[PDB]
Design a protein around this ligand. Structure first.
Ligand SMILES: CCNC(=O)c1noc(-c2cc(Cl)c(O)cc2O)c1-c1ccc(CN2CCOCC2)cc1
Length: 209
């Protein structure tokens, strides 16, 4: 029931660079994941212009940020178009071989890690703060799947038996021990205000008891 895949060499190389390079401005991961959510939400809205039934899986269009200090996880949930199994396998709906190669070439020329989104591979910035990332997703044309990687050159894909999502993507960041500031309400609010003020969807930061 669990399939294990090797990353393409270039993507493994970029993930190692992200994990091993000294770079203090780690907060940019949240801007990148919220940006991906906003793009996925725009995609389902665009499809709904010609087929209103595309929203039968959920009419709410939103992004939720759910910190969990007990599990040391930060979960980003959106109700966007979601990814099929093929999209997960194809580097989470990106042309990441091309993007990761171009980004690493720009870094060699003096660009910085914060420019990752310009290369269409911003998702991998999750590894600045997370030791493991789980991506649960549901697209109207496929079943609910879980993608997961702790880097190390491979990722797994499995059918998800967890809480059904209806439609969209949930990114669960299992944070590194020294990166728990990203579970603090004031810190998350600061990052969203700084980097995501023009995202056209409600971003709700959940409170913990
Ligand atoms: C059917 C095609 N599906 C989607 O595009 C989709 N569905 O769900 C997502 C998604 C991916 C990730 Cl990594 C998130 O963090 C959030 C999200 O909603 C996606 C995204 C996949 C990839 C991307 C990144 N862009 C891909 C195209 O080039 C610019 C960067 C954004 C969203």
């Amino acid at each position: 029931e669990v399939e294990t895949f090797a990353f393409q060499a270039e993507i493994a190389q970029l993930m190692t660079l992200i994990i091993n390079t000294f770079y203090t401005n780690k907060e940019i991961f949240l801007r990148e994941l919220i940006t991906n959510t906003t793009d996925a939400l725009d995609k389902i809205r665009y499809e709904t212009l010609t087929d209103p039934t595309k929203l039968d899986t959920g009419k709410e269009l939103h992004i939720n940020l759910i910190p969990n200090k007990q599990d040391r996880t930060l979960t980003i949930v959106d109700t966007g178009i979601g990814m099929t199994k093929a999209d997960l396998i194809n580097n989470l709906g990106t042309i990441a071989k091309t993007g990761t190669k171009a980004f690493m070439e720009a870094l060699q020329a003096g660009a910085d890690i914060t420019m990752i989104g310009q290369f269409g591979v911003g998702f991998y910035t999750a590894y600045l703060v997370a030791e493991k990332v789980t991506v649960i997703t549901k697209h109207n044309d496929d079943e609910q799947y879980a993608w997961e990687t702790t880097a190390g050159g491979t990722f797994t894909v499995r059918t998800d038996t967890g809480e059904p999502m209806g439609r969209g993507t949930k990114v669960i960041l299992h944070l590194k021990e020294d990166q728990t500031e990203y579970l603090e309400e004031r810190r998350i609010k600061e990052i969203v205000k700084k980097h995501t003020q023009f995202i056209g969807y409600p971003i709700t930061l959940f409170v913990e008891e």
